[PDB]
Amino acid sequence: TSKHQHPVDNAGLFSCMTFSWLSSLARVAHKKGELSMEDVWSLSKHESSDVNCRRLERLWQEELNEVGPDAASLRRVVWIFCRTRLILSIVCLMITQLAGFSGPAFMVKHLLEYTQATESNLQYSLLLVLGLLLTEIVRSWSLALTWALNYRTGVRLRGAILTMAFKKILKLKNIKEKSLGELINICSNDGQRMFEAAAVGSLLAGGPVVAILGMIYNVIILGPTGFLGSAVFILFYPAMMFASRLTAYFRRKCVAATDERVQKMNEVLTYIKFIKMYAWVKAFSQSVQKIREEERRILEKAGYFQSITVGVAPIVVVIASVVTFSVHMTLGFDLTAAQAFTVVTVFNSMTFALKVTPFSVKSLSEASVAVDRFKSLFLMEEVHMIKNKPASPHIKIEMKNATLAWDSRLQRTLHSIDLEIQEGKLVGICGSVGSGKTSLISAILGQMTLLEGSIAISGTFAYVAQQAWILNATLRDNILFGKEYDEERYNSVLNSCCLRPDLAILPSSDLTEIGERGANLSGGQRQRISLARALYSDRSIYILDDPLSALDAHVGNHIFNSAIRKHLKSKTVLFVTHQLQYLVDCDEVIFMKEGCITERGTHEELMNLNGDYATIFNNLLLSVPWSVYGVYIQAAGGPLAFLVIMALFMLNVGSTAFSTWWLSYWIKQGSGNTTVTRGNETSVSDSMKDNPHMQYYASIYALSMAVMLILKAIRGVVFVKGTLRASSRLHDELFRRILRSPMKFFDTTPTGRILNRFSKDMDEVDVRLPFQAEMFIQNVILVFFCVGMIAGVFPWFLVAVGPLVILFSVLHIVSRVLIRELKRLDNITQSPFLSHITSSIQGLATIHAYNKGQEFLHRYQELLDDNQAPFFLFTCAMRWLAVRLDLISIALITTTGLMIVLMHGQIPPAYAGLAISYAVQLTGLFQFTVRLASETEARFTSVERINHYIKTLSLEAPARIKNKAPSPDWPQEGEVTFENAEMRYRENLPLVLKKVSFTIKPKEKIGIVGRTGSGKSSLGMALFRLVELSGGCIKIDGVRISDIGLADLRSKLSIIPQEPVLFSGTVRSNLDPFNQYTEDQIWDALERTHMKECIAQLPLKLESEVMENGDNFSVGERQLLCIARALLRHCKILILDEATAAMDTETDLLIQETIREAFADCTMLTIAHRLHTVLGSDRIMVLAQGQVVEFDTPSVLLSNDSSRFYAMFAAAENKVAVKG
């Protein structure tokens, strides 16, 4: 942003309606290859936020004081705001519509009726071509001027309304009345709604008028049969409305289907380790397949209706023409080339305007909704700030028998408040929860209303909230909080709040960016930073509501003594606390009880009085390459599918072309040399009604229309099927590769990225790519068919076209290097805007207490203008490209007309009419082509990401090992032996298993206990072969697991995870998703784990719905279900991993004894750290950073003082005994 005056201000009418200043910017962008924020121009003074906000606020205030705030119309105010510019836009749009109608109708009618004449006049035909050229130029440039006015009007409206919304938001009493996302959307998206509304509705009020003009003109030309063409549009456009409604209806159900699929995919990715060690890959694969097929069916329906409503404008023209001319000629009327093709051209113009209109209606509807939301915002109750000064300056806060009430209506919580605070008196607030302390704080701040009495106040406020709002900036910026910098005072403040450890831990503490709520900081550090901000702010009154609650007692007391009893001895401090041991040194103590003042005074007086304050006192003491397109085509079915789809596209467009050509051919035939009686003499009469074969031509015309409709339906169905097949192939291959990659992938890659590939990359391909691809291919084939028709009539049209192809290529290059670099600048400047919005809305109370409601508004305005400049340039660049492509189209039509008039007598009038109709049809198709090409390129970037992941993922071990099945009874016993065990999770990482060797006899209860990182967590990983060994071997009963298949290895081992893993579905699904056991076995397992009574009591005992993670049972019930699932397998060796996590005592004993008795005959590998639980087992194994030092019975280890296990047992006993 750098300018003196914006180039739009120094632009004449020609530059405004051709956008030559943006041509200069486009030249700069193309030469550089990219744009920076310094290459764009700053907002004009006219579109600045402040002046427009002032205008809008004045207009709203006049409405409020004329009608009142219960019958006020913000729509009226927005109208009056935009009125003059909207009127100018409507005038220019009327000019555009008049020119667009006058060109085809009058110009083509006279041009074609000149070709039907017998004598050639060269000074009249050229005048007709000149008129056509001038009319096309006028309509193009008037539409450009309309868009230019609308863009500035919308930008001004957006800026003004967003600034007004933030102004209101910064002074809201009930901050939590509206939501936080709602308040964000008020300042973020509603402005875009208003901008789009302004521009596109200003377009709206020009659409139906040219349709009426065309209907009247068709009636004038033909007779009562023009109403036939008129009624086609009337019946047709509501049909496309209904198609849109149906597509939306089906896409609403597709949302639920996709949500279910993504939820299951999240379950698969989050607990992939559990699925691998349980060999449960197939069940989740089948469930995802079922959800995917139902989603695919819904997608098929939605895509069918979408394709139904894609490319109907030539279809409208052809249907209207067929009905009109068939019923015209079957009733015995007469028709010529001029009349028929003038009517066709008028149909084309009507379709153009009606293509414009519907989205305008939609935009105005969304505008009405947004204006309703804005009016709801602007009428909310505002927060005040008490200004009634006290009598004596010595008093800073003073009330008098006041009774204040909350607002939710008045909710009374304060009664007869007699409060007087003198300067320098540190006051403390005491009481119970809800006594009215925060109510007092809010009343002093200015959020409450007065009923009786008076409130006095003097001075400025600092504020440390209980949540410690942290500003989204650097740690030094949010300690100044808009204040000037000083070295010694800042250092003293930092030393006062104990920030030096914080300065040491953070990498660039004094310059570290902090999140809106706190990303790498703790609650105590947040409190310390808020306190530092308060002390630096240096105000007269301090409101510290529970500033040291989350803080530790030691550091809390340290800060209290070092700052509150030292720094603020000369200022007023409002200390609100729940820890009442701090008020022994306070100057004055205040106790609140049920909103009524009962006892206060000095600490010794409170001790002497033995009041309720004493009772609580004693209690506390106790761009993509061709490769991506080739990959997508191969996924769709290969070259054959592409050829079939292209063939059907060409068949549809050529059916429309054949309908038009058949009209031309039927007109060209004439009467076919028939002599008829017209009186006393007979002679040849050239009239299409005298053709003996006229009914044949009419029948073929109707057949052409029907065949075009059938081909459109077939094309839609086949395209939807092929695109969804491609997307399904991509999804299936990606899922297959995901379910078969080692845990190294899931460890080095966040699950968020993989879900993103599944969640939004799949959604993007599925819905978006077929839609944009269909629109692009339809438009390109239509352009090719129009050019081919005009060329089959005139090859020198191709001669002229060539250079225009070069110009189109140049335009596409320049308008693609510019529009893409303005799109990025638009959203780069939006990130600070949204961050500021969120940070401000999350800290409104602190902003209001600090009286910083204008600095944040100024920053909001600055960020809004920074965002608004590139967005304005972006829209104007859209219209710049549109103007130049319109120039190319105008050149095409002018060339066609010149050829029509230079070949008078050599071309039949019907073929000339056909050519001119297609030349006019060529209008407006180039901008759509360019924009759709860019959109499909983006969708294929998404496909590029998906295929990158598809061809990137590595391979796990094969499901079956060639070394063959070990045995049909393996393991026969539970003897496991280790020797020279080497294991490492990844490459270059230190080994976690360093020459570990031990033997375990069957039925032994072995409790693995050790320090963190000793390798306790790798026994299960190496036993299940999740990570291959780097040395040594693992042997069970003389069988080396290195030569047994993964399925045959994991099928005979069971593991109880540290946390309970429960998937969405039913209990039957979470207990035996393969349906391999009988009901009796399941119920015996359930009664073994004490679960039969809890399950049979449910109405759907074995079919009961299980929520995500099983948040419908208690923790004990979830653990019982997990042990039941493990027990259902009947495995000889099991790994139980530290199943203690915040559990009640008797439940812990019950689960411990249940595991003791259930697995009595199975070898137990208990991975736990609680030493007291492992006592009584057979042998105790202790690992020392990947090696075992002591391994024997606990009896011989606790009897030896030198034993390390005895040492840690003694340490644990001391930790339990000493609290202290």
Binding site: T309, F359, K823, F874, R879, A882
Partner: peptide
């Protein structure tokens, strides 16, 4: 969602994203 009639009029000079 996104229609082919809304897109045709919105690809005339507006951005192709409703949200």
């Amino acid at each position: 969602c996104q229609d082919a009639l809304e897109t045709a009029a919105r690809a005339e000079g507006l951005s192709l994203d409703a949200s």
